[PDB]
Amino acid sequence: TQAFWKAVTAEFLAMLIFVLLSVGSTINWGGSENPLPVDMVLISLCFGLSIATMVQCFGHISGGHINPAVTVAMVCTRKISIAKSVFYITAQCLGAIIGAGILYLVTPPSVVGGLGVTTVHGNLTAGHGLLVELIITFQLVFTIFASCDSKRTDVTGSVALAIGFSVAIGHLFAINYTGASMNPARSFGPAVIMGNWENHWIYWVGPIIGAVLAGALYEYVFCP
Amino acid sequence: TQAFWKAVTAEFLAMLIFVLLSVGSTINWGGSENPLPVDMVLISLCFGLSIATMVQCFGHISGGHINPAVTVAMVCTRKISIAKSVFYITAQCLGAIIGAGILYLVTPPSVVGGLGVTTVHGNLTAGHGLLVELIITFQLVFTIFASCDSKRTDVTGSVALAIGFSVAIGHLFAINYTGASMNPARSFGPAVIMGNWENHWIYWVGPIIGAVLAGALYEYVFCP
Amino acid sequence: TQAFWKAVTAEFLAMLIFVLLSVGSTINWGGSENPLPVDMVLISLCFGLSIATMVQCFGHISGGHINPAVTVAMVCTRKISIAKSVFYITAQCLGAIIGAGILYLVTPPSVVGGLGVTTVHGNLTAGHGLLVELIITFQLVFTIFASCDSKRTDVTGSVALAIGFSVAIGHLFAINYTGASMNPARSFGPAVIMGNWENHWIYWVGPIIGAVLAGALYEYVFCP
Amino acid sequence: TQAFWKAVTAEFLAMLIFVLLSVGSTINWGGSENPLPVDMVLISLCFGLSIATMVQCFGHISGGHINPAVTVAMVCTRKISIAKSVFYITAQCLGAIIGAGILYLVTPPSVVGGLGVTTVHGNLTAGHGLLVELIITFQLVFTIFASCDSKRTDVTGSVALAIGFSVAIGHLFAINYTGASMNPARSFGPAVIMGNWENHWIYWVGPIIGAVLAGALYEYVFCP
């Protein structure tokens, strides 16, 4: 086992640094430096680069699922056992919370902006709201599967990069609609700290489903 | 055949996600977050990263033409048969429409900004307007051919990346002139939905011609 | 010979597209979309990505000097003969002019912003003004030499990328001081068209010297 | 020895160009082009790209520690001898100063904005202020160790890139809190020139500690 403990550990750590890092960026802009639509590129970028860094950091040591939906679609595709996975998601979930609170600790007088409150922002009926998240986790999910799976026409890019990029695109587009949570873990860490789960289930339902279909289509209908 | 069906399929899907993704970005900025010239980098970037993601996603499974002009220059260079190609463009064309409408469905109260209305914006006589598109599809077209063709001094970069980048540059520069459509498929999906084809032919004429010359110069005059 | 003609040709073409592409970006922002300090990232980025594209496009076919100072430091390092090089610089120089004018042709009513007027902007005595250009062409020059030279600890990045990045950094920083010309060719194409050579020599003197020392230090003092 | 002299030299040079380059960017924005929160992406980006360039430039010739904390965590991990390292940090430290002053020389009438005054900006008690720096140097430190160390599942990305990216993320997030110094050398060069060390020790204490733990965790608890 024990070798596994390191994996769960790396995983707990990767999440904490990411949320702390990412959310910190959304908040950071939440300052008095004339908040502009530029915040979007900046936020989007930070998340996109944080993950690439994280896969770079613990991607080999833990696999790099670092996402409820990703860790979930993994099990259904059948990779990380039903049992071992639950810890993954839990290490992630704490990592979400811990790295978030400590972040909260750093800038308590400007965090109000949310501290990473991924809550169906655009005022559109849950379905239409959840749909966006549905598709994105999918594309992200898909990218990871596509890029990382075994046996390919031999690609020349950084597996570590595209995912960041998928994230990249993910935010740029999804940010205003649903907040582009596209990761239960990251959304969850702030929800414990804000004390508000405005339709939190939406983040588990969409991303997980968006997680399953992409992982599936690749396995089934796309590559036997 | 059937193996082919997957290819047409991947292709239909790649386009839908891209337009939905890309256009969504142009619109998304179309909010009340002080619209600035920053929109440009953001838009430009989203498209540039979306494609890289898409080639990453279905680039191997379908080849990654995902563009009337690209799929067209391919046939003239002689790669995808006259017959098989027509479907490619059609899967793309629907994918343009479907992913666009559903996008329309998500943000119906702010889409007005266009929903991706790539229509010769800069008020300059069609020729001067179409010229820009002429050249860009070319450079994009060229990049793909240059980077992807067989036998090279062995490059060290991500084939998946440069194209995104070509896109990248493409928008940054072409956006205000003609809207930088540089892809019949993407332009077309919104045109069905807006109900306006302000000189739509310009997008088929330029990009296709810009498509043919780049693909040609590489084949003929540059690499026998 | 003739095989060479293609090289000079690719080279003429690469420059034209780059200036047209790059300058177009500086001007493009020169619109009525609330010009902001954001223009910098955008400009910087376009140039940085345009070159990477260009090396990607004609980097193998011509070598990818595409710069008076670069093509010059090459000869002193001794690579492209004294004779063959003069054409290189000339193909580049025309390419600068041709791609620039035609650009001028596209947006004649907003180009006034310069059309790429790389002229010692910051009001600082030529020496202090030329110094900045001195150092940058060097670092760029150096990057190309460092990255591309033969026999290395075997790098894992895109040779095509770093140069773009060197460009990237180059602009971000040098833009306001001297206009970050860092390339005689690109500066020259607009100078013929604006009809003003406000201390044009500064662009040939600095970049060339900045070109020679970097190419030298690598050859001499750094790698025997 | 002498071969070593080149290493110390490359190292002195890399730092100078980086600070000059990076700080120059923070200041450059310090102009009359409507300073916005966009400055952040721009700054963040310049540093992130400057380093990647620098590792690209002298990363092989000197190893690419180019950071007190990095050069320090290296010795504790045991790589560069106790003796040889002190020079490294010193070449870096001068390089910080020299490249900074000369920068100061270029734009003396607008530098006031700081000239790179990485001083615990956010008004939060040293501990909370130093903490941020603590963690970042770590993640950066970690990335370098993770990416560069020997024997790995064989990565497909640019070792030269991730570090830049770690920098990338680093700034985006840390900039407003502590100024995101995340490098004693870079912070130090301006401190000699501003004549103010507002809690300078914070930059040596945090980054060094953040430097040691990341380098450690990788060596110990993560990879025996």
UniProtKB/Swiss-Prot annotation, chains A, B, C, D:
Tissue-specificity statement: Detected in cerebellum. Detected on pericapillary astrocyte endfeet in cerebellum, and in skeletal muscle. Detected in glial lamellae in the hypothalamus (at protein level). Abundant in mature brain cortex, cerebellum and spinal cord. Highly expressed in the ependymal cell lining the aqueductal system and over the space of the brain in contact with the subarachnoid space. Detected in paraventricular and supraoptic nuclei, the granule cell layer of the dentate gyrus and the Purkinje cell layer in the cerebellum. Only weakly detectable in eye, kidney, intestine, and lung.
Key words of the record: Cell membrane, Cell projection, Endosome, Glycoprotein, Lipoprotein, Membrane, Palmitate, Phosphoprotein, Repeat, Transmembrane, Transmembrane helix, Transport
Phosphoserine: residues carrying this PTM: 81, 150
Predominant place of localization: membrane
Motif (NPA 2): 183-185
Intramembrane-annotated stretches: 64-71, 179-192
Subcellular location: Cell membrane; Basolateral cell membrane; Endosome membrane; Cell membrane, Sarcolemma
Catalysed reactions, as listed in the record: H2O(in) = H2O(out)
Regions of this protein lying in the Extracellular compartment: 28-39, 107-125, 176-178, 193-201
Sequence motif NPA 1, residues: 67-69
Positions glycosylated per UniProt: 123
Outcome of substituting residue 150 to A: Decreases internalization from the cell membrane in response to PKC activation
One term under GO cellular component: cell-cell junction
Post-translational modification remark: Phosphorylation by PKC at Ser-150 promotes internalization from the cell membrane, reducing the conductance by 50%. Phosphorylation by PKG at Ser-81 in response to glutamate increases conductance by 40%.
Physiological role: Forms a water-specific channel. Plays an important role in brain water homeostasis and in glymphatic solute transport. Required for a normal rate of water exchange across the blood brain interface. Required for normal levels of cerebrospinal fluid influx into the brain cortex and parenchyma along paravascular spaces that surround penetrating arteries, and for normal drainage of interstitial fluid along paravenous drainage pathways. Thereby, it is required for normal clearance of solutes from the brain interstitial fluid, including soluble beta-amyloid peptides derived from APP.
Protein name from the UniProt record: Aquaporin-4
Parent-protein start and end of this portion: 31 to 254 of 323
